[PDB]
Amino acid sequence: MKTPITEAIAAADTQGRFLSNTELQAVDGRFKRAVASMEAARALTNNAQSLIDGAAQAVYQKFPYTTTMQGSQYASTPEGKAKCARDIGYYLRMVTYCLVAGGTGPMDEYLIAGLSEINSTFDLSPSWYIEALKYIKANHGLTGQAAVEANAYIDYAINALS
Amino acid sequence: MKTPITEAIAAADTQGRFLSNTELQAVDGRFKRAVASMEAARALTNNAQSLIDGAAQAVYQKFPYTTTMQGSQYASTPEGKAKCARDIGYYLRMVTYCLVAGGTGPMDEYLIAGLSEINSTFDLSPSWYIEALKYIKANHGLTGQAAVEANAYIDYAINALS
Amino acid sequence: MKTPITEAIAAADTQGRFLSNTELQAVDGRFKRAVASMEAARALTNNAQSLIDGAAQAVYQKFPYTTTMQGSQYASTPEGKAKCARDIGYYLRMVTYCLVAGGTGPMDEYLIAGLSEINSTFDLSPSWYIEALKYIKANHGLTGQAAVEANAYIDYAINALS
Amino acid sequence: MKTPITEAIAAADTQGRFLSNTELQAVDGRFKRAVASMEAARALTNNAQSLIDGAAQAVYQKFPYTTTMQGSQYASTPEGKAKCARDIGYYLRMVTYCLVAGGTGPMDEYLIAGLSEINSTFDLSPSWYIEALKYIKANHGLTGQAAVEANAYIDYAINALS
Amino acid sequence: MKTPITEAIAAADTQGRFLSNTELQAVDGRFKRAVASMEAARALTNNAQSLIDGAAQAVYQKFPYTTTMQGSQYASTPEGKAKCARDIGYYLRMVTYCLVAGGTGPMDEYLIAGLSEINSTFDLSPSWYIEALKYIKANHGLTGQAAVEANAYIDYAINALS
Amino acid sequence: MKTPITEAIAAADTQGRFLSNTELQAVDGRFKRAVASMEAARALTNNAQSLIDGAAQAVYQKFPYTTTMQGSQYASTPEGKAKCARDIGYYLRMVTYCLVAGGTGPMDEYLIAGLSEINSTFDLSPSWYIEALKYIKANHGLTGQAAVEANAYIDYAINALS
Amino acid sequence: MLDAFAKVVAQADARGEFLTNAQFDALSNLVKEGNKRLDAVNRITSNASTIVANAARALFAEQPQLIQPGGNAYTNRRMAACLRDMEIILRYVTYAILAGDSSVLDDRCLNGLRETYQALGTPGSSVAVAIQKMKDAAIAIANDPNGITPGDCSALMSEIAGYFDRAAAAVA
Amino acid sequence: MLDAFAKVVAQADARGEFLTNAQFDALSNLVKEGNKRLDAVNRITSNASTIVANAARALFAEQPQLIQPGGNAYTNRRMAACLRDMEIILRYVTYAILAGDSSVLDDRCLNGLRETYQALGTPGSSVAVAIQKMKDAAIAIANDPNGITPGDCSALMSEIAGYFDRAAAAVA
Amino acid sequence: MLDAFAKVVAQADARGEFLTNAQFDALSNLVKEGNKRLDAVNRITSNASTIVANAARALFAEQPQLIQPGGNAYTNRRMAACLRDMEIILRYVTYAILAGDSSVLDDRCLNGLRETYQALGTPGSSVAVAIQKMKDAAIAIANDPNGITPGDCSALMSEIAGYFDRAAAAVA
Amino acid sequence: MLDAFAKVVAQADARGEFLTNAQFDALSNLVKEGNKRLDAVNRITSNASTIVANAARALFAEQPQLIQPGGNAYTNRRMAACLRDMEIILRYVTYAILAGDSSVLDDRCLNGLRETYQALGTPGSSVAVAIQKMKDAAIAIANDPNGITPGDCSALMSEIAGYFDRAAAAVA
Amino acid sequence: MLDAFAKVVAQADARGEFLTNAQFDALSNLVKEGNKRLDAVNRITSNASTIVANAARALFAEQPQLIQPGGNAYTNRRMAACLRDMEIILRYVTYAILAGDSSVLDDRCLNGLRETYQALGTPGSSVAVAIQKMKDAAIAIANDPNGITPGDCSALMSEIAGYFDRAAAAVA
Amino acid sequence: MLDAFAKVVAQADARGEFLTNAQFDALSNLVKEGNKRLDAVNRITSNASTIVANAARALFAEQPQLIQPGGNAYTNRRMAACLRDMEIILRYVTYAILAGDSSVLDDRCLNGLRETYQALGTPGSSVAVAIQKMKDAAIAIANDPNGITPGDCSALMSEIAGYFDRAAAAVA
Numbered sequence A, B, C, D, E, F: 001m002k003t004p005i006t007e008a009i010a011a012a013d014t015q016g017r018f019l020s021n022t023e024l025q026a027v028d029g030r031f032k033r034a035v036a037s038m039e040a041a042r043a044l045t046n047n048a049q050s051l052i053d054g055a056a057q058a059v060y061q062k063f064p065y066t067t068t069m070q071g072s073q074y075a076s077t078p079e080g081k082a083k084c085a086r087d088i089g090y091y092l093r094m095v096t097y098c099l100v101a102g103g104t105g106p107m108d109e110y111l112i113a114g115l116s117e118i119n120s121t122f123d124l125s126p127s128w129y130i131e132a133l134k135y136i137k138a139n140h141g142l143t144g145q146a147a148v149e150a151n152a153y154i155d156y157a158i159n160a161l162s
Numbered sequence G, H, I, J, K, L: 001m002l003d004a005f006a007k008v009v010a011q012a013d014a015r016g017e018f019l020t021n022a023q024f025d026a027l028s029n030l031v032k033e034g035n036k037r038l039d040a041v042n043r044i045t046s047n048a049s050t051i052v053a054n055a056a057r058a059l060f061a062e063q064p065q066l067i068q069p070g071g072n073a074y075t076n077r078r079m080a081a082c083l084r085d086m087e088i089i090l091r092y093v094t095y096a097i098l099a100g101d102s103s104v105l106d107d108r109c110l111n112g113l114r115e116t117y118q119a120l121g122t123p124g125s126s127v128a129v130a131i132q133k134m135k136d137a138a139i140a141i142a143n144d145p146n147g148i149t150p151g152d153c154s155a156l157m158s159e160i161a162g163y164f165d166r167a168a169a170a171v172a
């Protein structure tokens, strides 16, 4: 899983080398940034339900047809509303994992690998998820470098859907 | 040349990826550590002549035969004394470059690649250079994290000779 | 470009072999099927405008938001309506080319390669194009083996979008 | 084994693709040609003994030394006459198999692979077998496209011996 | 070209090594054997015409059909007799070259590479050339280690035709 | 293990070929040279103790610090004197093995592979061993081609240390 | 790989025999039935995406444990691998239909697949359910009486079901 | 690689156009003439070994310098390479006949061949003679009136000659 | 590849010299400005998809010949290649921003690119337009005063513009 | 490969759960202790050559059978391989220290190593002795109170010893 | 691979010993007998094609089941593989003769061959018959008293027979 | 690669000729001189390390610009490459001595080397100086009258000097 620490180790290992100061600096950078990352991860977790609930409604407001159009890919049934809330919760959970791990690895492995195939197969629109992520970014309530951390991983997900 | 910044870029590039937060943290770690690294590099540079002169004499004291034994590989002539002082100055200069660059790249490229071949071809003993480096480590006058930085690269050179 | 004839040649060539009876039979099959394929290609061409016009309206009827939602990816402006009619005409033109060539090569090279990237980049929904293709299949007016030919390539495009 | 059907499948499979119309046409060509191929295969089988017997004598007439020269590679003993009749029957049997299978695969796998090595090792002259095949072509009694089918595979064998 | 000297060099070179005693011994073996090899090469050259003339007649005696059968691959015309005498002279010349060079390289490069293809394409029987070579072996008039040398390369050619 | 015989076999085998005269000559060269090689090997063995004892003292005379300097890599203790005598005996034993085998294989496999790593790791100077080998070369008492054989392998070892 | 014709040839060659009249007749009959076989392959292939997606959706509705966090089809990478396997198995089944012989399916798809799933922890029993769902949908599509010259494809549908059942038995 | 149908499609796509009635008619006519094209390919291929060997023997009889010691086709390795080139060129010409388009011949065989022969010292003029000999023999075989339903193949023979002449011009 | 620090080291090594006080000061100043550089890279990268897509849409609106049938960005394969090139160039520009040196951009992206486009027939002048559009958008995003500690990034924006202009000059 | 943070994330994902406050606290505490971990890695790595060489010399003094002719570390090739293994094991142990998790050591170094030594005839018991010697030296170096800000690294040293013991148990 | 000299060296190195006078004498005697060994290799190799072909013809005459349709040497591909194996085994036996040691034969030819034949269905017992036939012919050729300086090669012929018997035992 | 014998054979084959008595005599004379050639190769090779190192030390003493910072042999990587080139050139010269023909040296070492040095910026004139120094030392060693059966090696030394001069001319 890609984190600053596993990337540092993997670099040394690919070169058949002991860790050098070059790599220890990278890990120190991660340890220092973790103060902001952990603040963001705790806040997003503490407010996860309101963020998920608000984000789903932002999608339905942007794309009203998702609430009315017939088909199991839409949120026009209780089952589809529950799938959508589940998925949005998955995205938010992955953001918190990236913050905890200090890199994109969790989202890369558990969500982005295969993402295009799943959205095409099940007829899920990437724009729906982009709107949910934009809502989370706008409304997470963070400031300072905690906001910078959260937004980096939210924008990473938006880029992956674009 | 290996620095924390070029390693971060090379990782992203090998993966065909834009830089992510994973890599920006590594560079921030380098920028923060550079305060100590630059203090060490300036001090070693300011005192370079006394360190080189003292280090050469430490070698001659540890290995007195290098001052008397006949042969161009030894420091028993003016020319050989000058070669040895030159080489010790090369090592110290490379340490300062590693400190400036934040990693081992300068020493790797300009000194360590081919080192074993040169020492074998010209009959130069690695132990001579190890003793010079030990003297520099003992006597550079640094404290705190500046000392940690200098000693990391001095010990890296000693490991390369071992 | 993939046709039954170029595939037969490419098979012989990969094996370093002259064409054998094995390959000449494949080409005869293509020449015989071309009677039905050419009937389909001529009919789809002769009725191309009404098929394109009807197919675009089928999309707008299935997905009414595409006529009203703000954004250049939608058909809510004259420019967007023209892009959509253009694209549907591209699909139909590619179907006729596959029929003329006796295989999927034209659609593979000119439309399917890069399709997923384009639809994701420009936020175009695959379902829109699937609906247009379903309309063409339902309403091309062909019967017999000409219909079988047309529908094979229309369904190939639908599969590529799924 | 190479037939039009296994070649069509192998093409799709090498490309990681479902079969397309491109490949189904090739198989239809094989199914249509099979009418002529099966007529040829049945006729050659029904008259196999007279064709083999006549072909062996054609060889002995073209190359009289094969009936008199001392050596186990020649047909100057009962055992050698039986080997030669056996071999000619093998060739004719392989022709019928190619006709049944719709391609060269049976002859390729059971006879042509290793053919040059066997003829060199056992001192068997390719010209002997060419003459037998020419006799079969001249005297199989087929007309129309059945003759075209038989002669394609007979001439394929002659080419393999040349 | 394969000789004991070029093989010794090629071995050292493949290993990135200077020549060692291991290789110099191989060359000394070649220089010592060259006494016998050169005796054989001179004798075969001095008697080349009678050996070629006698060898061609040995072939015609073993295979009388080659003197009477119609076809340009046979020696039943003046042109075909001249081709056959030419070819037998080629074989004998190659034997002398192998003796001069101390190895099979000349025959490998100028005659054996492509041999099977030529004999099959032009309908030339390997047995014809084997008989010519057997005649040369039986009648070259050499004794002792000169005979051993000549026969090694003659038998090498026979093996290549078998 | 590299000898003239295993190199001849390995050449044939890499080419998928039976041994040819090209290779048998190389082995004859080895068998003839073995007369001188075995004379050298027996003489070096018979006088091994005096050669080892004299060679160690030659090293101590050339490099007096090895008898006095503190450290387990030096011969300034009984244990270090015994290690040095052991090592010199290893070199001489390997020379005799090369002579017996007719090539460098024994020394390559048992001593030279890993040599640079061992001397660097344990801080053993290549010059020490070069001096021992020079003493053996000067004082083995051989003449003629036996001396040429011994000196070839002694000089091979010196080159490996240079 | 063998097709139905190569299979008969291979059996005859091992006996050193020309074909009998009955064997010729059997292969001529396969040719005479060939249009139906082409229709079945065309129809199944032309609906491959919905056959796969509908069967997958139904599997996960009946077996929600597969998609719960920790389940074998949870995460998009595992979901994509599962859908891919369904497409692969359907693809090789259609190859067997075209060939009239299971060898391509056995050799290039089914052999070793049970052991693959065991090493990964993938529930082969659940794969067999997905295969059976694809079978039922593919046969309903191939044997749809609308839009085709009327005739009896029952023998062919039994053959098709056999290939699907063979794949399901190989993974379960 | 293009065949005659793909060539028309490619030209139309670059213009963004559906085909015209005249273009449809021209491609339908190629299909209607297809049996003759298959016969020509079958006949030439079925006689490939003698087309090559007869042309080679005639070349060396007319140009004995090629086979004298030191000549470009002297030694069995060079003779075999020369025969191989003749087979290769004939093979790619037959591919062009089947395709009704020279692209496969141009792209996979003729492009760069002149420069290859110049680097090797092979006389391209002599290769062109061999190609012309194969052309004459191949056309006589393909257009033999015996043993085939009578009809006019003159247009096709002109097309075939064009492919051979194209190859000869590319090496000379 | 060099970063700004390695560049100074490399120049000093070629002279055999320790660094001067002025050189140390210049590198210390780069470190002190490092937060701004990280912000610029983060901001541009975090908006990469819209920077590319908006610039592409604008290029094709101004230069409709590129997307007309026969144009260099017509067909989805060519459109995808064009978008990919835009992403690649933006990616290497951001690497140069992080490094404070253009070497990675020159060595791994720009060197030979003009010749590539000439061999393909791609209009390098039009690529330069796309690059300039990405430049303007990237600088507006990187230098947005909202949501960041106020300070002067003008020197850094001039450096960023230089990298984009370097890429545009290399293709035009 | 996992680090200590990825390990917690992976466990949470398999449950589909956000982290708890206690889990956040535990990871924050690892970060707060991070300087000590960096010191330990720096100190061990900076002394790697002597840790290896001293441990090797001591092993061969206690176990002279390994270096007698016929012994597993006799000949320079086998001695070099033995020293290399010691360096490799130390290297992967230091990776585990940096990561705060043994996965890299288990996956890239220890898994299958026992079987490797059994196939070669290398005495794994003797390798374990060498590992234990490196452990004692590495901990004495990492935990040296001189030249470092005073504080308690006892928990970290216990973790470090655990990684060495894990490697020794895997080979013995 | 070892030859007879390297074998003695390897045994001595494992003991850390110089050679004894008896060991030197034994190797000197091998050298003194070397001409006979070269003659045997030359004679066998120079007749390799007939040794193989005669042994093969005799095997198939005694064991006609191998060449009947369905038998392991039926079809030209299997016949060619069988002849190739005979040539390979003879080749490696001659290498062992030149080396005076079986290691090359054991390592590069015989090890694993029994299992290969079992996986294929090849009757190893029949291979052993072919090997024994080659043995008898090769020894009769190598030990032919005509055309060679008279002397006693009986020890060498026993050694040669041993290598053939070793190969036959390894496959049977 | 050719040796002196293969060169004569190749010239004769291009003429289709058996060798003349004079050509046989010339090759017999090369064999009769062979011991001297073996001595020269043995002597040069046995002193290769000092030939290279002494020539290198002398070059750098005469041309200190090569080792000053910025010079082509400054840094250990460039010094090692320079020493390697000297060893390579000496190695291929010794191969030419053994072969009695320069083809191996020309084909595997000298062809293209001038262009290599020009692309790198390596001063070929300085390489030629190093080669000339190795020449003088190698000839003095090969032609040392001590410790060898007395005789005249002057022709051979002229041949050896020619190979060195050929290498020097190829780089300068």
Ligand SMILES: *[C@@H](C)[C@H]1/C(=C/c2[nH]c(/C=C3N=C(/C=C4\NC(=O)C(CC)=C4C)C(C)=C\3CCC(=O)O)c(CCC(=O)O)c2C)NC(=O)[C@@H]1C
Pocket (backbone or CB within 6 Å): A033, A144, A145, A148, B021, B024, B025, B028, I032, I033, I034, I035, I036, I037, I038, I039, I040, I042, I142, I143, I144, I145, I148, I149, I150, I151, I152, I153, I156
């Ligand atoms: C021009 C770019 C605009 C601008 C920049 C600006 N930024 C800061 C201060 C900070 N920026 C960061 C950002 C990061 N640190 C990291 O480690 C990473 C990678 C994960 C990033 C993205 C940080 C931590 C700071 C310090 C804390 C803070 O938020 O202030 C400044 C202040 C001066 C300085 O250099 O620190 C400035 C000026 N401000 C503008 O107005 C420009 C539009």
